[PDB]
C-alpha cells in the first residue's frame, strides 16, 4: 500500500500514487514515508506549501528520514525559503555525512546567498568524502573565481575535466576564467572542447570570437562572430562586436552596416554610437561624428572615450574651449587618458 504509492510515483501516475499514499494514512496516520510520497506528488504539481507541510509532518514523525529532508529542501528552494532549506540540508548531513551530493547542493545554496567561505567548506568536505566527484571540483572553481582567485579557479576546473572529460559546463567555466586571465590559447582549447559537446552554443561562440580578436586573429574572429549572430540574431552587442572586428580588418563599409544594424535594434547602444562616430571621424565627416558622440554621451554621460573623441573633432572644428572641457572630463573619468594624450 506504500510500495504501490511509490511504484505509481516512479511511473508519474500521480493521481494513483496519491490515492495509494492517502489509503496508507487512512490505515495508519503514523507511517512517515506516506506523507513524504504525498509531498512528492504535490511537489511535481507545483503545490509547494502543501508539499512542505507534508514533508514537515513526515519529519515530525521520523526525524532520521534523510529523503524527507532532501525533498523538503528542494521544495523550500523552489518556494524561495532559502535558509530553511539550508537547515534541512544541515539535518540531513547530521544523519548521513557521506551524502556528498547533498553537501554539494548545500554548497550551491550557500554560494547563492553570498556565504562563499561556508560554500567552500561544503565543497571541500564533499571532495574529502568522494575525491572523484567532478561537480564539486567545478563548483569550488566557481567560488574561487568569484573571490578573484584565478589560479585556484583554473586548478579546480581542470581537475573537474580530468575527472569527467565530458563535463561541458566545467569546460565553459575553464574557458571563461582563462579568457579573464588572458591565457588565450588555453581558452580557445577549452571553448573548442565545449563546442564539441554543444556545437551551437551561442554564448561560447561569442566568447571564442573575442578570444580570437584578443589574439589578433581578426579573420577567424570575424568568422566566429558571424556564426554567433546566426545563432542568436536579434541582439545588438553581437553586431557591434562583429563590426569592431570588421573595422580592425579595414572592411569599413560592412562595419558601418553592422553598427547600423545594432542601432536599429537598440537606438541607445552607446558602443555602436561611438564606434560608428569613429568611422565618420576617420573618413572626415566631422559633423556626423560630432552628432554621434553627442548621442553616445546622452546615453552614457560618463563615457570617457566618447568625451575624448568628441574633444578631438571639436578641436578640428576650432571649437577649442568646448574641446578642452571634453579633454578634461575624459581625464577626470579615466586618468590614463592624460598618458595616452602625452604619448
Residue numbers in the entry: 58 to 400
What does the paper say about this structure?
O-linked β-N-acetyl-D-glucosamine (O-GlcNAc) transferase (OGT) and hydrolase (OGA) control a dynamic, reversible, and tightly regulated post-translational modification termed O-GlcNAcylation. OGT possesses 13.5 tetratricopeptide repeats (TPRs) at the N terminus, which harbor all currently known ID-associated mutations (Lubas et al., 1997). In OGT, the TPRs form a 120-Å superhelix, which serves as a potential interaction surface for substrates and binding partners (Jínek et al., 2004, Zeytuni and Zarivach, 2012). Recently, mutations in the N terminus of human OGT have been associated with ID, namely, A319T, L254F, R284P, and Δ155-177 (Bouazzi et al., 2015, Niranjan et al., 2015, Willems et al., 2017).
The ID-associated mutation L254F (Vaidyanathan et al., 2017) is located on TPR helix 7, distant from the active site. To investigate structural changes attributable to the L254F mutation, we determined the crystal structure of the mutant TPR domain (TPRL254F). Diffraction data were collected to 1.75 Å and initial refinement starting from the TPRWT structure required substantial rebuilding of the terminal TPRs, an early indication of considerable conformational changes. In wild-type OGT, L254 occupies the interface between the helices of TPR7, with its side chain constricted in a pocket formed by the surrounding residues N223, L225, Y228, and R250. Mutation of L254 to the bulkier Phe appears to be accommodated in this pocket, however, by causing small changes in torsion angles of the residues lining the pocket and by displacing TPR helix 7B away from helix 7A by 1.5 Å. Increasing shifts of the TPRs starting from the mutation site lead to a maximum shift of 12 Å for the N-terminal TPR. The melting curve for TPRL254F was shifted, yielding a Tm of 55°C, indicative of reduced thermal stability. In sTPRL254F conformation 1 (sTPRL254F-C1), the F254 side chain occupies the same position as observed in the TPRL254F crystal structure, while in sTPRL254F conformation 2 (sTPRL254F-C2), the F254 phenyl moiety interacts with the side chains of N223, L225, and Y228 and the backbone of the F224 and R250. Thus, the L254F mutation destabilizes the interface between TPRs 6 and 7. The data presented here show that the L254F mutation causes a subtle structural distortion at the mutation site that propagates through the TPR superhelix, resulting in a substantial displacement of the N-terminal TPRs and a markedly increased structural plasticity compared with the TPRWT.
